[PDB]
């Protein structure tokens, strides 16, 4: 498997970053919110959250921890396309850690299903 | 951000994978496990789970999983080098879902951080 394979074949949702706009991403990410990786590529995050509110607060949020420690993770609420709710873990590590919402690389996972535990 | 850089600059762990064995891993999988990625490299899964038994029973719970969706998540103890207990988010996606712990991609995330 080379990178570009893995990248999407992943079991998760990845996206490629810039000031928070979606410059690549995957097939499971665009299975995630609902809709096709062409609806996704160009366009910023703020869509994928509940509101732009949301997309305000929780940058805000990332800031400091990004540049604090040079990752970022969490659990929160976003947004499908057609609008359903539902919680999402997401991770980030910005290229350079002092400038956190540039370019990056971002994970994300749908907390919906039950989780298997082995 | 080219693929290999976005790999390589990941917040989780990664890992290309061929029969169980590490072919390739991200410096995060190596912070995870308290190693370097030399320590990884050509590796058997097996070293990272809590025993060989362990690695036995789990691939047993993985292999009909990936057959029957095409893809694998769970939470389970694995072990740091020199030997620290942690729970761990995996998931995988196998290149082929009726071979499906030949090649893949793997993911680790601890959850105890
Ligand atoms: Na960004
Ligand atoms: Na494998």
């Not at 394979?5 to 996206?15: K, N, R």
């Not at 980030?92 to 370019?103: F, N, Q, S, V």
């Not at 919906?112 to 535990?117: M, Q």
């Amino acid at each position: 498997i080379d990178y570009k394979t893995a990248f999407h074949l992943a079991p998760i949702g990845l996206v490629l970053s810039r000031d928070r706009v979606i410059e690549d991403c995957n097939d499971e990410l665009a299975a995630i919110f609902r809709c096709a990786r062409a609806d996704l590529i160009g366009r910023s995050f703020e869509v994928l959250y509940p509101s732009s509110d949301e997309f305000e607060r929780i940058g805000e949020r990332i800031s400091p921890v990004m540049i604090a420690h040079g990752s970022y993770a969490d659990d929160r609420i976003m947004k499908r396309a057609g609008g359903e709710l539902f919680w999402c873990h997401v991770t980030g590590r910005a290229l350079d850690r002092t400038a956190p919402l540039a370019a990056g690389v971002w994970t994300f996972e749908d907390l919906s299903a039950t989780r298997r535990v082995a």
